[PDB]
Design an enzyme around this catalytic site. Structure first.
Site, PDB file in Angstrom:
ATOM      1  N   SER A 173      71.480  67.858  61.217  1.00 44.72           N
ATOM      2  CA  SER A 173      70.595  67.984  60.068  1.00 44.72           C
ATOM      3  C   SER A 173      69.797  69.289  60.110  1.00 44.72           C
ATOM      4  O   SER A 173      69.766  70.049  59.139  1.00 44.72           O
ATOM      5  CB  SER A 173      69.653  66.773  60.004  1.00 44.72           C
ATOM      6  OG  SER A 173      68.905  66.635  61.203  1.00 44.72           O
TER       7      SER A 173
ATOM      8  N   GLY B 253      67.912  63.640  63.576  1.00 46.46           N
ATOM      9  CA  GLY B 253      67.279  64.704  62.814  1.00 46.46           C
ATOM     10  C   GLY B 253      66.832  65.895  63.635  1.00 46.46           C
ATOM     11  O   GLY B 253      65.770  66.468  63.381  1.00 46.46           O
TER      12      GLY B 253
ATOM     13  N   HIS C  41      69.048  64.115  56.929  1.00 49.09           N
ATOM     14  CA  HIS C  41      68.935  63.367  58.168  1.00 49.09           C
ATOM     15  C   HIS C  41      70.216  63.371  58.987  1.00 49.09           C
ATOM     16  O   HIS C  41      71.323  63.512  58.459  1.00 49.09           O
ATOM     17  CB  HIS C  41      68.469  61.931  57.889  1.00 49.09           C
ATOM     18  CG  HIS C  41      69.566  61.003  57.485  1.00 49.09           C
ATOM     19  ND1 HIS C  41      70.407  60.408  58.400  1.00 49.09           N
ATOM     20  CD2 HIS C  41      69.965  60.568  56.265  1.00 49.09           C
ATOM     21  CE1 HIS C  41      71.277  59.646  57.761  1.00 49.09           C
ATOM     22  NE2 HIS C  41      71.030  59.725  56.466  1.00 49.09           N
ATOM     23  N   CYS C  42      70.019  63.221  60.291  1.00 52.25           N
ATOM     24  CA  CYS C  42      71.065  63.218  61.310  1.00 52.25           C
ATOM     25  C   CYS C  42      70.911  61.820  61.918  1.00 52.25           C
ATOM     26  O   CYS C  42      70.419  60.914  61.243  1.00 52.25           O
ATOM     27  CB  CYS C  42      70.722  64.349  62.323  1.00 52.25           C
ATOM     28  SG  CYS C  42      71.649  64.523  63.873  1.00 52.25           S
ATOM     29  N   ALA C  43      71.340  61.627  63.161  1.00 53.48           N
ATOM     30  CA  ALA C  43      71.152  60.333  63.809  1.00 53.48           C
ATOM     31  C   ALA C  43      69.775  60.459  64.455  1.00 53.48           C
ATOM     32  O   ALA C  43      69.071  59.471  64.654  1.00 53.48           O
ATOM     33  CB  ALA C  43      72.217  60.097  64.870  1.00 53.48           C
TER      34      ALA C  43
END
Length: 169
Positions: free
Chosen positions: A121, A117, A113-115
């Protein structure tokens, strides 16, 4: 040899109408946002055993190992910034090794996950597919975008583009 401009077209051209918080973009490999990463219930429901947080840091998504104390999952934090000049490539190999090992296990369910995604990510997943799955950058994007709207930084793309030339040889 796909150009950067091409890659970008490819990304925008075939986008779905909406974006979920998380999607399985490859068998047992999920791409998601910070909302999904903080939703422990959801993570337990999907049987996630591994979490690669590409937006670690007290000023970004400050979850960390502590956050998942109860659940019995593995945490891998990466303090990456999402601007086109951040060097994410340095984590391509170590993350790909991490994903591969996690997916070599029956229980293995990985969430990157990213902030949001969609950039950091997604870039790591694309790198994973290219490295451990023998895919070209193009095939990787196609594989993933068929399950989630992704859009790595032009810089991340440049980095992936360099990886593609390296793997190609």
């Amino acid at each position: 040899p796909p150009t950067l401009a091409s890659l970008q077209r490819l990304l925008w051209v075939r986008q779905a109408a909406t974006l979920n918080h998380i999607d399985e973009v490859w068998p047992s490999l999920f791409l998601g946002d910070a909302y999904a990463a903080r939703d422990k219930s959801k993570l337990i429901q999907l049987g996630i055993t591994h979490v690669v947080n590409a937006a670690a840091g007290k000023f970004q998504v400050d979850t960390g190992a502590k956050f998942y104390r109860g659940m019995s999952l593995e945490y891998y934090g990466i303090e990456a910034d999402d601007n086109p000049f951040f060097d994410l490539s340095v984590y391509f190999l170590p993350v790909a090794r991490y994903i591969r090992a996690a997916l070599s296990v029956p229980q293995g369910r990985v969430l990157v996950h990213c902030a949001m995604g969609v950039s950091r990510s997604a870039t790591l997943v694309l790198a994973f597919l290219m490295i451990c799955e023998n895919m070209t950058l193009v095939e990787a994007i196609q594989t993933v975008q068929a399950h989630r709207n992704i859009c790595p930084n032009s810089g991340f793309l440049r980095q992936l583009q360099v990886l593609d030339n390296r793997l190609g040889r």
